[PDB]
Structure formats: C-alpha cells, structure tokens
Amino acid sequence: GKSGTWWDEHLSEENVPFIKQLVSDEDKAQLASKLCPLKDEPWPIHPWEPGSFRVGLIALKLGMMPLWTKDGQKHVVTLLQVQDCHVLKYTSKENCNGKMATLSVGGKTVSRFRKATSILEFYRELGLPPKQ
C-alpha cells in the first residue's frame, strides 16, 4: 500500500520557495521562448481561398461593459482576454475522420504540480506550460 503524495509534502521550509521560484522562472522562460514563431521554422503560409476555415482561440471572460454607437444606440459588450493561447498539436486530414484537418489549441497556463503525468510529458515535449 503506497500512500498518496503532493508536490510539496516532503519539501523543506527553505526548499519550498526555492522550488516555486525555479519552476516559475522555467515556466516564464518557456513562455518567452515562443515569442517569435516566424523565425524558428514557420510552416508555409498559404493564401486565403473562398472555401477555407482558420483556427480559433481560447479566451477568458472578463466581464461586461457598456458601449455606444455613432447613432447614439447602446450595446452591452463582453470582454474576452487571451491569456496564453498556443497551438498544441495538429492532426492530418486522414488521421481523425478524413473530413477536415484539426488543430488543438490550449488555454491559460496552470501549475505543473497538479496535472496528469502523460499530459506533463506531452507539454514537456512541446516545450510550453500546461494549459487549463
């Protein structure tokens, strides 16, 4: 019988802030490493065709606000913030259903200490923080 455990159970009083600091720095460095997609090795950029569809994104609902138009009408709007949105993986047309290609996109960054190990390995290979 193996008891459960969390990330900071056996860590010491001095080692807890060190681990937090180091992991946060590694996270921020990984996030900053992806700031220049067009210089690493971008995939070819195709022109837009009539019957084409592009990728969306994951946002965060901030709140609602008033807004006014030039004719004096009032419309309520919702603010959606893009916190850390990255393309995670791409499956070919024939590898999912043969109907359309798929792009997986991730949301805001979360902690690495509370994720599945397979997900952790995936994000380690991708070189990015885990997404909610």
Cα atoms found within 13 Å of the Cα of residue 56, Cβ hemisphere only: 4
Q: Which residues neighbour 87 within 8 Å (Cβ) at sequence distance 6 or greater? A: 55, 103, 104, 105, 106
122 counts as binding another protein under rule CB under 8 A: no
Phi (first) and psi of residue 68, to 5 degrees: -130, 145
| Distance from C-alpha of 130 to C-alpha of 102, rounded to nearest angstrom | 20
Taking the least distance from each CB to another protein, the nearer of 16 and 64 is 16
| Contact pick of 52, 69, 97, 117 for another protein (by CB under 8 A) | 117
Taking residues 21 to 50 in sequence order and writing x for each that binds another protein by CB under 8 A, - otherwise, the string is -xx---------------------------
Q: How far is the CB of 115 from another protein (least distance, A)?
A: 9
Contact 36, 130 (CB under 8 A): no
Range in contact with another protein (rule: CB under 8 A) among 18-26, 30-38, 53-61, 97-105: 18-26
Please give the residue ranges that form the binding site for another protein (CB under 8 A): 1-7, 9-16, 18-19, 22-23, 112-113, 117, 120, 124
